[PDB]
Amino acid sequence: IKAFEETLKGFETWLKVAMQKATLIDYNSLTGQALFQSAIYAPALSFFSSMGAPFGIIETFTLAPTKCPYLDGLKISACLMEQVIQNYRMIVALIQNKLS
Amino acid sequence: DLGKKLLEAALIGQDDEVRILMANGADVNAMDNFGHTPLHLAAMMGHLEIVEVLLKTGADVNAFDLTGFTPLHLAAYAGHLEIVEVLLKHGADVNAQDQDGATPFDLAAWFGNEDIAEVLQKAA
């Protein structure tokens, strides 16, 4: 369970940076979309997989840009970042059901 | 599957596990599905000792991921000054560009990491 605790700590360490920097990512630009993939979506996938593995939870988080209907690419990034945090909440709820 | 384990430990920040994996033959060049090496992930996360371990065991300081970012790009975006300094000391390329011409200085400037931007400007 120590490995799972370390995963939570890594996730929260990553989250603190991602939550502030995501608001500056223009998702409609070439560099911004790429940076969102490289530095937000990819690490999130890895953390979520590491969280789910000790508990048999096999889910694949996918971004849903259709739920972010904004012309402003900064608002898209913030909205997609919120989907990341929401997925965390969903996995935590699944883990708590397994534990209880 | 030592490469995947190393990528995972380097992102999470499991220093002991990274050291164990390198001693047991893990590939320092292991690549995730986004083109990241472990050094990419540790530098982005600010894991200083893991960055040091990976560089000591042969990591390419200037590796590009599939989106055209180097470890220096990611540390300059994320705001980890000490990582940036260590990468520069190990020959990180300040003029590395992503697919739309963005340098590490550009990311540091756009994301408000002023100390890093100043270090990168002086290094250039």
Residue numbers in the entry:
A (entry chain B): 205 to 304
B (entry chain A): 15 to 138
Quote the passages of the study that discuss this structure, keeping the authors' original sentences.
The bacterial human pathogen Helicobacter pylori produces a type IV secretion system (cagT4SS) to inject the oncoprotein CagA into gastric cells. While the composition of the pilus is unclear, CagI is present at the surface of the bacterium and required for pilus formation. Using Alpha Fold 2 and Small Angle X-ray scattering, it was found that CagI forms elongated dimers mediated by rod-shape N-terminal domains (CagIN) prolonged by globular C-terminal domains (CagIC). Three Designed Ankyrin Repeat Proteins (DARPins) K2, K5 and K8 selected against CagI interacted with CagIC with subnanomolar affinities.
The two complex structures revealed that each asymmetric unit contained one DARPin molecule and a fragment of CagI that had undergone proteolysis during crystallisation. The K5 and K2 interaction site of CagI consists of a hydrophobic groove formed by α4 and α5 residues. Interactions between DARPins and CagI are widespread along the groove and extend to the concave face formed by the DARPin variable loops that wrap around α5. Interestingly, sequences of DARPin K2 and K5 differed only by a single amino-acid at position 125, being a leucine for K5 and a phenylalanine for K2 suggesting that the binding modes of the two DARPins were similar but with a 10-fold increase in affinity for K2 compared to K5. A single residue difference between K2 and K5 in the C-cap moiety of the DARPin generates small but significant changes in the DARPin/CagI interface. In K2, the phenylalanine 125 inserts deeper into the pocket and is stabilised by a T-shaped pi-stacking with the nearby Y91. In addition, the side chain of CagI residue K225 makes two hydrogen bonds with the carbonyl of the F125 main chain and the N127 side chain of DARPin K2. As a consequence, the surface buried by complex formation is slightly increased in CagI:K2 with 994 Å2 compared to 974 Å2 in CagI:K5. Crystals of CagI:K5 and CagI:K2 diffracted to resolutions of 2.0 Å and 1.8 Å, respectively and belonged to the orthorhombic space group P212121 with very similar cell dimensions. DARPin K2 efficiently inhibits AGS cell binding to full-length CagI or CagIC in a dose-dependent manner but had no effect on AGS cell binding to CagL.
